[PDB]
Every structure is written in C-alpha cells, then in structure tokens.
Amino acid sequence: WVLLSTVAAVVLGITTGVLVREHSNLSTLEKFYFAFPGEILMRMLKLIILPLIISSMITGVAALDSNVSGKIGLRAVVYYFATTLIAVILGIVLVVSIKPGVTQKVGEIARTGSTPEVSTVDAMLDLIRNMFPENLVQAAFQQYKTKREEEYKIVGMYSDGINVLGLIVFALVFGLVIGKMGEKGQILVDFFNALSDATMKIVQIIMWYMPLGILFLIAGCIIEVEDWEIFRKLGLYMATVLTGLAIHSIVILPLIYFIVVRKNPFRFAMGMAQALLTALMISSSSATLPVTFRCAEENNQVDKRITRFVLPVGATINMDGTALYEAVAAVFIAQLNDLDLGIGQIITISITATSASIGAAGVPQAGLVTMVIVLSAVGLPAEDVTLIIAVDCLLDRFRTMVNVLGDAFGTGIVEKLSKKELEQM
C-alpha cells in the first residue's frame, strides 16, 4: 500500500493540479495555501535529517573495524567520484553534440530571477570551513558563509540551514573514536543504535502522511507556474539536460551496477521507486534520505552496515545529477554568447562542475550558486544564470532523482565490493 498510495497521490495531484489551474484562477497567496499540506510534509522530512544523519553515520562507522570502515569509505568515495565524472562527461558530450545554444540567441531568451553574488575562492573555502564547524549545536541548523567586504576584507557569518557537511564529518570521526574505545564507548554505540532505529520508526509514521503531502506537493507546483511558453524557448536546453539525466539513470548507472554486481539493475532500481518518486517531488536528497534508507534495506536487501555509511555521505557529496546539469548549463550559456569553447575551456568546466552542491542537497538556488562558479571559471558573466532560473525548479526535481539514484546504486556496488569484509566479520 505504501508504493501504490504514492503513485495514486501523484496521479491525483497532477489531475488536481492541472484542473485547478486550467479551470480555477488562484492568486499567489491562494496558490501558497493550496500547497500547505505539501509544505507540512517538507518540514516533517527535514525534521528527520539531523537525527538520521548523526545516528546513521555514528552507528555505521562504529559497527565496522577501522580498516574495514576505511576500505568501505574508500570504495564509496571512488564510486562517488567515478560516477560524478562520467555524468559530467556525458553532459559535456551531449551539449556539445546537440548544440542547444548555437540554435538560439541571447536576446530571445527571457531573463528571470536574481543571480547570486558568489566568489569562487570564498565559496570553495566555505566548503572546508563547513566541514569543521566552530559549534556542533550551531551546525545542527546553521551554516557558515564568507563575503568580501571593504583593500578587501573577508567577513563571515552564520545563516539558517543545517550543516550536513560538518555533521557528517564529526559523525564519521565520532563513530571511529567510539568504535575503537570498545566497552568504554559501547554505551554510545547502543545509544545511537536505538536513536537510529527510533528515527526509522518515526519515518514509518511520516510515510502514512506522505501520500497526502505528495498530492498537494505535485499539484501545487503545477499551479505555481504562471507561464508555460517560457519552457518552450528553453526546450532544447531542457531536452539535453533530461537526455543526459535519462542516459545516466537508465544506461550508465545500471551498467556500472551490473558489471560490479552481476544482478539485474532494474530490479534494484525498482525497489528504490518509492525513494526516487519522493526525490522527484521534494527536490531534496537529504530530505528523501530516510525513504532511501528503507528502500535500500527493506526492498533491495542491502546490508545495513553499508547503507548507514554510503547513503548519508552520498546524499552530501554524490551529485551526479547536479554535476551533469552544471556541465550542460555552462556550455549552453557559452553557446548562447557565441563563445567558442576549446579543450582547455571544456576541461575546466569539468573539474568545476564536479564540485557542485557538495554541501547543498535541498538548499535552494544551490545549482545557481554552482553555475556562477562554473561560468566564472571560463569567463562568462555571472548574470547569464538568469537565463536558466525559469526552468531550474523543474530540472531540480529530476536532478534530485538522479542524485538519489546514484546513492542507491552505490550501496549495492559498495556492498558487493566489500562482501569479503562483511563476511570476515
């Protein structure tokens, strides 16, 4: 009933959403109140991130030996990097071959939204700063950001938004320490094992409300969009983005899973359908993590030791979907400006696009912030990001699904590559 209700909710939500806007006329305030049931689900899933991330990372690392944990972590990191690179290369090839921007002009495309003010050096240094928060309690709900102020002086401040990067790094180090302690640290292992189990049970309670929240979540966004002809001007740009995401999700990732794990990848992906559908509706890899936990464990029979480690980390640093999107968007913006891109310029977009949304799964405008960095790398104005924000919300839905799908396949791949370790213990 859990999966069926989710499918029923989207159909009713899409049916309700299209009918409401086509027949009824709603103001901006009336549109916001319509999506309120979905909004409640959004903050019920966000409420679970902190307890889930902390107890999963501590419990997963603490359960394994130091060497076993290191090898499992090394395998996951290689898979994260390997798949993100392939996603970027696929985006580069598709956008270069399809040439979405060479068939269009800058003037014709409408400009929407505001381009964020980003410093490439400060944004990347902020990544390392957030890995090591100054306060653990503050990191639970706030993040650090630095701005250049004046001959220039760096001023930093904390803003609302959970620092998943800092919490995961501490939870990994904390899990390693309490595991080595043994009997001394057993009480902490037991405490965070119960907290992890309790958090999963609370997710089960949230799943009861998810169908009703999903209905209004999908319905609301369909009603939010006031203009549909804007999607037609960027259709070629959208087509290449979804073509790359579809190929990565349906060809590349299943192929990698099959080679490492001699099993049907679509059977594995079928078990994740509930998590993939949730990601497609909430546009957050961290908020959909609790759903990914159940699908990987309950449906795909993936080891809980592997899942507790790979999934929380993957939701934070594994963004194949976003990395592909930045590579396609950056080259597309380059083509609009009639800017020929050489091998040197193409390469730098690849490395810059790789470091996309490394601490912003669910953070809004996370893709625009990265796009500014990627565009600035090869010298295009950061104001060209305004040409993409029109359809960024829709693409964000599909980005998150591919971001979550990469994590799910990583658990199966890492589990197979560490089979000797799990049996050895």
Under rule CB under 5 A, residue 6 binds Na ion: no
Q: Please, which residue, 104 or 285, has the CB nearer to Na ion? A: 285
Give me the residue whose beta carbon is nearest to Na ion.
84
CB contact set of 270 (below 8 Å; sequence gap of 6+)? 299
Structure tokens at 211: 């169908």
Under rule CB under 5 A, residue 83 binds Na ion: yes
Structure tokens at 152: 């220039």
Q: Which residues pair with 147 in a beta bridge?
A: 155
CB contact set of 389 (below 8 Å; sequence gap of 6+)? 112, 113, 368
Q: Which stretch binds Na ion (CB under 5 A): 8-16, 107-115, 218-226, 306-314?
A: 306-314
Distance between CA 348 and CA 327 in Å, rounded? 10
Distance between CA 215 and CA 99 in Å, rounded? 37
Q: How many residues bind Na ion (CB under 5 A)?
A: 10
Which residue, 122, 121, 115, is CA-closest to 155?
122
Q: Which stretch binds Na ion (CB under 5 A): 185-193, 319-327, 339-347, 411-419?
A: 319-327
The reply to whether 103 sits in an annotated binding site is no
Q: Please, which residue, 199 or 400, has the CB nearer to Na ion? A: 400
Choosing from 392, 396, 407, 421, the residue that interacts with Na ion (CB under 5 A) is 407
How many angstroms separate the Cα of 404 from the Cα of each of 97, 289, 423? 27, 8, 27
Choosing from 284, 403, 411, 418, the residue that interacts with Na ion (CB under 5 A) is 403
Q: Which stretch binds Na ion (CB under 5 A): 165-173, 175-183, 297-305, 403-411?
A: 403-411
Choosing from 6, 16, 59, 84, the residue that interacts with Na ion (CB under 5 A) is 84
The reply to whether 285 sits in an annotated binding site is yes
Q: Which stretch binds Na ion (CB under 5 A): 170-178, 315-323, 324-332, 345-353?
A: 315-323
Q: Please, which residue, 80 or 144, has the CB nearer to Na ion? A: 80
Distance between CA 389 and CA 393 in Å, rounded? 7
Distance between CA 216 and CA 15 in Å, rounded? 11
Residue showing tokens 């620092």: 163
Distance between CA 87 and CA 284 in Å, rounded? 19
Under rule CB under 5 A, residue 55 binds Na ion: no
Helices (H) and strands (E) in the chain, counts: 21, 2
The reply to whether 120 sits in an annotated binding site is no
Which residue, 147, 118, 90, is CA-closest to 327?
90
Residues 35-54 that bind Na ion (CB under 5 A): none
How many angstroms separate the Cα of 424 from the Cα of each of 77, 151, 175, 377? 22, 59, 20, 47
H or E stretch at 156: strand 153-160
Q: Please, which residue, 113 or 364, has the CB nearer to Na ion? A: 364
Q: Please, which residue, 129 or 248, has the CB nearer to Na ion? A: 248
Least CB distance from residue 256 to Na ion, whole Å?
Answer: 10
Choosing from 69, 285, 292, 418, the residue that interacts with Na ion (CB under 5 A) is 285
Under rule CB under 5 A, residue 80 binds Na ion: yes
Distance between CA 145 and CA 163 in Å, rounded? 11
Choosing from 13, 314, 362, 367, the residue that interacts with Na ion (CB under 5 A) is 314
SS3 content of the chain, % helix, strand, coil (to 5): 75, 5, 20
Q: Please, which residue, 17 or 367, has the CB nearer to Na ion? A: 367
Least CB distance from residue 248 to Na ion, whole Å?
Answer: 10
Distance between CA 415 and CA 143 in Å, rounded? 32
Least CB distance from residue 80 to Na ion, whole Å?
Answer: 4
Under rule CB under 5 A, residue 318 binds Na ion: yes
Give the number of other CB atoms < 10 A from CB of residue 232: 10
Q: Residues within the annotated binding site for L-aspartate? A: 283, 285, 322, 363, 399-400, 403
Q: Residues within the annotated binding site for Na(+)? A: 80, 83-84, 314, 316, 318, 320, 357-358, 360, 403, 407
Q: Residues within the annotated binding site? A: 80, 83-84, 283, 285, 314, 316, 318, 320, 322, 357-358, 360, 363, 399-400, 403, 407
Binding region for Na ion (CB under 5 A): 80, 83-84, 285, 314-315, 318, 320, 403, 407
